[PDB]
Amino acid sequence: VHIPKAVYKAVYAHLYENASLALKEYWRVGNVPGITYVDENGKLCNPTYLHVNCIMQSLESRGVVKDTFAWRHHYYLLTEKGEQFIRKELDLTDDVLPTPYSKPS
């Protein structure tokens, strides 16, 4: 619950770069192998499931992203509003766009 700002920025940046978040329905103690950050820790460290789950819950409840549970994985996707929000925190400007807008190829 005492989530550092670095985790917030890392999550948001991964969101923007892949416009997505294929997360797991997990509640024990563990580390996400994808998103990673290097701050205070001094090296690119993973975050813990509890923090990210709380953050994404807040995001969804706020309408920024929407989910689509299937088996045991959460699949989130961000909307136009979310794009118009994430852009603000990461010091972005309107012109910059997410990567999938362009061709994956």
Partner: protein, 85 residues
């Protein structure tokens, strides 16, 4: 309690260093990397569960599925299993 310590004869008898043979069952990497944190989930044990419905009872580990039996007759056709003979 970071400065406490006991008689060495009481410290040669600690447990075997070779960690533990009780790791959780993780199907993929997405699960994990490996105050209350001191004891939130220290009870480390297998928790293998249906990768569909997340249930710890009646899980077919055979062939590395990890699929409950009730959560299996539905998807058998999709997977490829067919009911003949």
């Amino acid at each position: 309690r970071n400065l406490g310590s006991c008689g060495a004869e009481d410290l040669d008898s600690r447990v075997h260093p070779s960690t533990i043979f009780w790791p959780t069952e993780a199907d993929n990497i997405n699960l994990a990397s490996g105050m209350r944190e001191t004891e939130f989930c220290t009870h480390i044990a297998h928790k293998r569960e249906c990768r569909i419905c997340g249930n710890y009872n009646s899980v077919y580990r055979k062939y590395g599925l990890f699929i409950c039996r009730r959560c299996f007759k539905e998807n058998a056709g999709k997977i490829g299993f067919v009911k003949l003979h």
